[PDB]
Design a protein around this ligand. Structure first.
Ligand SMILES: CC(=O)N[C@@H]1[C@@H](O[C@@H]2O[C@H](CO)[C@H](O)[C@H](O[C@]3(C(=O)O)C[C@H](O)[C@@H](NC(C)=O)[C@H]([C@H](O)[C@H](O)CO)O3)[C@H]2O)[C@@H](O)[C@@H](CO)O[C@@H]1O
Ligand SMILES: [Ca+2]
Ligand SMILES: [Ca+2]
Ligand SMILES: [Ca+2]
Ligand SMILES: [Ca+2]
Ligand SMILES: [Ca+2]
Ligand SMILES: [Ca+2]
Ligand SMILES: [Ca+2]
Lengths: 197, 193
């Protein structure tokens, strides 16, 4: 008889950014070559993460889980935009457990995986814009602020379109990402006096 | 022998907006059918409007100023972006005079014309944007503010590109024109839950 449960390989460094779709894979094998299903939990208790999803495609099919061709389970979702990040941002993670059944009733013992989530500015590092030349450094005109915003946007296509770029009276740039985290560009790297140049 | 000066028609409503080029026409007629030249002044004194210019095309040509085809003098210019606007609008204007003469040298009296000038928001009146649906009416997200600005811009190609559109936490829209005058679009014309 089959008395050996499936073996699960977990990803070692799962990093998610708030408001951005992410994915990772579990790889599962069984000596029988067949895995019936899995369970994601909090050490046997409810998962408690409704934004976490996975496909049951190819579950409980003969030969779906061999050493040569493991069952690859795609887990995906989006950490909510406003998921709380405490003062110590290392605390921004969820430790959860996974186990799997074979077709003979053997279930593996829960093993852990960790979903770390971070603010969007942790992912994005804005390049300085081409300098906008202005008439008064202490008081930008509406067209100068438009130009600055355009310049910052142009120098940073990798930044999400849903991020909002604002410009202060002295040309200080604020980039506010969809999750409301921010990056700043100081005025001296954004604007210069036109006449002096 | 011609002893009668030309007659001049001026526009009744010359309204210029700060920083934006305006144009208008004088129409001049003489009984001879010919007008030689004109003069713009401040009741005979220097005009004092260096940003105003007019064309001298077809001056002093026979037949350039008949009853049926008057001399049409194109005037244009741009009132300074930072021209101070008096609290009383009846003083937000330049009162000036034009005279003209024919080939015999008959000169008209000084005829008054008035260039009124106004802030850019007196011209612009923002159209309604497509409504943007938001999560919290009292606290818009960055993405929702982007959506709002984009909608206001898309609905208003006639507003200067140089105008800056800002969005507050509650979806109130401020449009700041190049001359720093403003319009406001109330939140309830902008966002919905
Ligand atoms: C509630 C309880 O006592 N559960 C224990 C459980 O303890 C968990 O053990 C994990 C390591 O195996 C972590 O130490 C868990 O702490 C964390 C995590 O999930 O990594 C710390 C994070 O900072 C925190 N995240 C936030 C945003 O605060 C999370 C969070 O509180 C929960 O994961 C959300 O539900 O927790 C720690 O809670 C473990 O020891 C098992 C062993 O059987 O026993 C109980 O279930
Ligand atoms: Ca087995
Ligand atoms: Ca950053
Ligand atoms: Ca005459
Ligand atoms: Ca003619
Ligand atoms: Ca207006
Ligand atoms: Ca008006
Ligand atoms: Ca903008």
């Amino acid at each position: 008889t089959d008395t050996t449960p499936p073996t699960i390989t977990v990803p070692s460094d799962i990093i998610a950014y708030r408001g951005e779709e992410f994915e990772f894979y579990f790889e599962i094998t069984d000596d029988s070559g067949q895995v019936k299903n899995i369970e994601l939990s909090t050490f046997g208790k409810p998962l408690g993460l409704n934004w976490l999803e996975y496909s049951e495609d190819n579950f409980n099919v003969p030969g779906n889980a061999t050493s040569d061709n493991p069952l690859r389970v795609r887990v995906h979702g989006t950490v909510p935009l406003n998921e709380p990040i405490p003062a110590d941002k290392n605390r921004a993670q969820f430790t959860r457990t996974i186990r799997a059944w074979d077709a003979a009733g053997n279930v593996s013992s829960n093993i852990t995986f960790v979903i770390k989530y971070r603010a969007q500015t942790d992912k994005y590092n804005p390049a300085d814009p081409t300098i906008t030349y202005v008439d008064r450094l202490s008081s930008l005109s509406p067209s100068e602020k438009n130009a600055v915003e355009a310049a910052v946007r142009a120098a940073n296509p990798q930044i999400p379109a849903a991020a909002r770029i604002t410009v202060s009276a002295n040309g200080t740039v604020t980039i506010t990402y969809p999750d409301s985290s921010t990056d700043t560009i100081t005025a001296n790297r954004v604007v210069k006096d036109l006449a002096s140049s």
